[PDB]
Design an enzyme around this catalytic site. Structure first.
Site, mmCIF file in Angstrom:
data_model
loop_
_atom_site.group_PDB
_atom_site.id
_atom_site.type_symbol
_atom_site.label_atom_id
_atom_site.label_comp_id
_atom_site.label_asym_id
_atom_site.label_seq_id
_atom_site.Cartn_x
_atom_site.Cartn_y
_atom_site.Cartn_z
ATOM 1 C CD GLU A 24 -3.013 -1.270 2.172
ATOM 2 O OE1 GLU A 24 -2.616 -1.220 3.359
ATOM 3 O OE2 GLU A 24 -4.213 -1.427 1.868
ATOM 4 C CD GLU B 260 -3.701 -7.059 2.611
ATOM 5 O OE1 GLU B 260 -4.733 -6.492 3.044
ATOM 6 O OE2 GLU B 260 -2.574 -6.509 2.620
HETATM 7 C C1 IPT Z 1 -10.381 0.372 5.349
HETATM 8 C C2 IPT Z 1 -9.784 0.352 3.935
HETATM 9 C C3 IPT Z 1 -10.057 1.668 3.210
HETATM 10 S S1 IPT Z 1 -8.037 0.008 3.948
HETATM 11 C C4 IPT Z 1 -7.850 -1.683 4.418
HETATM 12 O O1 IPT Z 1 -7.882 -1.737 5.848
HETATM 13 C C5 IPT Z 1 -7.882 -3.080 6.333
HETATM 14 C C6 IPT Z 1 -8.305 -3.012 7.797
HETATM 15 O O2 IPT Z 1 -8.063 -4.235 8.495
HETATM 16 C C7 IPT Z 1 -6.522 -3.729 6.018
HETATM 17 O O3 IPT Z 1 -5.450 -3.071 6.711
HETATM 18 C C8 IPT Z 1 -6.251 -3.663 4.508
HETATM 19 O O4 IPT Z 1 -4.897 -4.047 4.202
HETATM 20 C C9 IPT Z 1 -6.534 -2.279 3.910
HETATM 21 O O5 IPT Z 1 -6.592 -2.418 2.487
#
Ligand code: IPT
Ligand code: MG
Ligand code: NA
Ligand code: NA
Lengths: 211, 210
Positions: free
Chosen positions: A69, A145
Site C-alpha cells: 500500500e 489479501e
Molecule cells: C479500510 C480500507 C479503506 S483500507 C484496508 O484496511 C484493512 C483493515 O483491516 C486492512 O489493513 C487492509 O490491508 C486495507 O486495504
C-alpha cells in the site's frame, strides 16, 4: 521482514513464505507521493536490498515483495528490476497501484471479489475470474489479501475456493489475517481483558479494525 | 437444348453431412452470361486505413483474359451516390513479382479516399466501385462492379475489432429453408429474415454450413 527465527521455522516445518520489504506509505495523498519521488529512492532501496541480503538463502522464501500500500511509483519499478537482476530464483510481487503494474510478476489484488467487479477509477478491483482474461493479460493471480476475517466473518469463503480449483491461473491467496491484534488491559481486580484501538487514550484511532 | 443429369449422391456427399433435410436438384438460379473475348476475368477490392480511419486507400487488383495489348486500360472509379469520389486509370502490367517478371495480364489501381464513410452493421455505408476495361482512347469493352464497404476487421491484443472497436456479436445461425420450396431461396424470404433479425437486435449471421 520478520524475526530471523521465523524463516528457520518455515524452512524446517514447511511453509511457503512471501518475504516483504518494510515499506508502507498508505496515509500519503496520493498513495505514491513518496514512492514516485527520487529523493525517497535511497531510503526505499535499503529496505528492499538489505532484506534480500539477509534472507536470500532461505528455501521457505519463494517470493519477494516490494512492500504494501504505497501506490505505484518509479521507485518500485527500479527496485523490482534490482531484485530481478540480483536474484532470478524468486518472482517479485507488489500490489500497489492496481495490483497488475509493471512492478509485479503476479497479479496480486487485495479483496478482489470472485464474480463481482469493483470498477474504481485508476485502480479497479476486477472480479478475479475476469482479471485473468483482460486483453493481453497472461500472469498468474494470487490474492495478497482476501476474506477479511474481522469478527463474525469469512462469509463467501467457499466461493473463492471453488474458483481457485476451477481456474488454473487462479492460484489462491493469503487470508487477512492470522491473529487479532488485541492487547491485554486489566480491571480494578487485576482481571485481564482484550483491548482494541482507543482503549489506551490513543486518538485518533481506528477502534476494532486491529482485530 | 440443355440436358442436365443430377445425381442425388456423390463422393461430394461425404463432405455434405450438415444437420438438415437431405434434398437434391437444381435448387439455385441458372443463367447465361455473355463476356467479350478480351474480358475482366477477376477483380479484388481491398480497403486499408490510417490509425484513426480518417484516410483510406482503396486497392483494386484486376485480371484480364484475351490478347494483351498496349492500348488496353482499366479504370476503377468509386462513387458515393451520383458523386464520383475517386478514379484511377492504368495500363496492364503488374509490378515485378520474381526472377521471371510480373503479371502482364494484371493491374492494381490505388485510390485515395479522405474521411471515408465507414461500413458497419450499425450504419451500412456503401460506395459503388466500377471497374471499366477499355482502350486508351476511351472505348468501353466491358464494365463490372460491386458495392464497397470501407471497414477494417482485425484481431488485436485478443480482441476482434471492427474499425478499431471491439465487436459484440449478436448472432444467429441461419440455414436456407422454406417450408414449401425446401432449400430454394427467394428475395422475399431473404428480406423477411433480415428485417426480423434486425428488428430483434441481431447484427450478425453465420452461413451454417455452406
Ligand atoms: C479500510 C480500507 C479503506 S483500507 C484496508 O484496511 C484493512 C483493515 O483491516 C486492512 O489493513 C487492509 O490491508 C486495507 O486495504
Ligand atoms: Mg452436424
Ligand atoms: Na487454480
Ligand atoms: Na486491520
Amino acid at each position: 521482514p520478520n524475526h530471523p527465527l521465523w524463516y528457520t521455522l518455515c524452512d524446517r516445518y514447511g511453509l511457503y513464505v512471501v518475504d516483504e520489504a518494510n515499506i508502507e506509505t498508505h496515509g500519503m495523498v496520493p498513495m505514491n507521493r513518496l514512492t514516485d519521488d527520487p529523493r525517497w529512492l535511497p531510503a526505499m532501496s535499503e529496505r528492499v536490498t538489505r532484506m534480500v541480503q539477509r534472507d536470500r538463502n532461505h528455501p521457505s522464501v519463494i517470493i519477494w515483495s516490494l512492500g504494501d500500500e504505497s501506490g505505484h511509483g518509479a521507485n518500485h519499478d527500479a527496485l523490482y528490476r534490482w531484485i530481478k537482476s540480483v536474484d532470478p530464483s524468486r518472482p517479485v510481487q507488489y500490489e500497489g497501484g492496481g495490483a497488475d503494474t509493471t512492478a509485479t510478476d503476479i497479479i496480486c489484488p487485495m479483496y478482489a471479489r470472485v464474480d463481482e467487479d469493483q470498477p474504481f477509477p485508476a485502480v479497479p478491483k476486477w472480479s478475479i475470474k475476469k482479471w485473468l482474461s483482460l486483453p493481453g493479460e497472461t500472469r498468474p493471480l494470487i490474492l495478497c489479501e482476501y476474506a477479511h476475517a474481522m469478527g463474525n466473518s469469512l462469509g463467501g469463503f467457499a466461493k473463492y475456493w471453488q474458483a481457485f480449483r476451477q481456474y488454473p491461473r487462479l492460484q489462491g491467496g493469503f487470508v487477512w489475517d492470522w491473529v487479532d491484534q488485541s492487547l491485554i488491559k486489566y480491571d480494578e481486580n487485576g482481571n485481564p481483558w482484550s483491548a482494541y484501538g482507543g482503549d489506551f487514550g490513543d486518538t485518533p484511532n481506528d477502534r476494532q479494525f486491529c482485530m | 437444348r440443355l440436358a442436365v443429369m443430377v445425381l442425388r449422391w456423390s463422393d461430394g456427399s461425404y463432405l455434405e453431412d450438415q444437420d438438415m433435410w437431405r434434398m437434391s436438384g437444381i435448387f439455385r438460379d441458372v443463367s447465361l452470361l455473355h463476356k467479350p473475348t478480351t474480358q475482366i476475368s477477376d477483380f479484388h477490392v481491398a480497403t486499408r486505413f490510417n490509425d484513426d480511419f480518417s484516410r483510406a486507400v482503396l486497392e483494386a487488383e484486376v485480371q484480364m483474359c484475351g490478347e494483351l495489348r498496349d492500348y488496353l486500360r482499366v479504370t476503377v472509379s468509386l462513387w458515393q451516390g451520383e458523386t464520383q469520389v475517386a478514379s484511377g486509370t492504368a495500363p496492364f502490367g503488374g509490378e515485378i513479382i520474381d526472377e521471371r517478371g510480373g503479371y502482364a495480364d494484371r493491374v492494381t489501381l490505388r485510390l485515395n479516399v479522405e474521411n471515408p464513410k465507414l461500413w458497419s452493421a450499425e450504419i451500412p455505408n456503401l460506395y459503388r466501385a466500377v471497374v471499366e476495361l477499355h482502350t486508351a482512347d476511351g472505348t468501353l469493352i466491358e464494365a463490372e462492379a460491386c458495392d464497397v464497404g470501407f471497414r477494417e476487421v482485425r484481431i488485436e491484443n485478443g480482441l476482434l475489432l471492427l474499425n478499431g472497436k471491439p465487436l459484440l456479436i449478436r448472432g444467429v445461425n441461419r440455414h436456407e429453408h422454406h417450408p414449401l420450396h425446401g432449400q430454394v431461396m427467394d428475395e422475399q424470404t431473404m428480406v423477411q429474415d433480415i428485417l426480423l433479425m434486425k428488428q430483434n437486435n441481431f447484427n450478425a449471421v453465420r452461413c451454417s454450413h455452406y
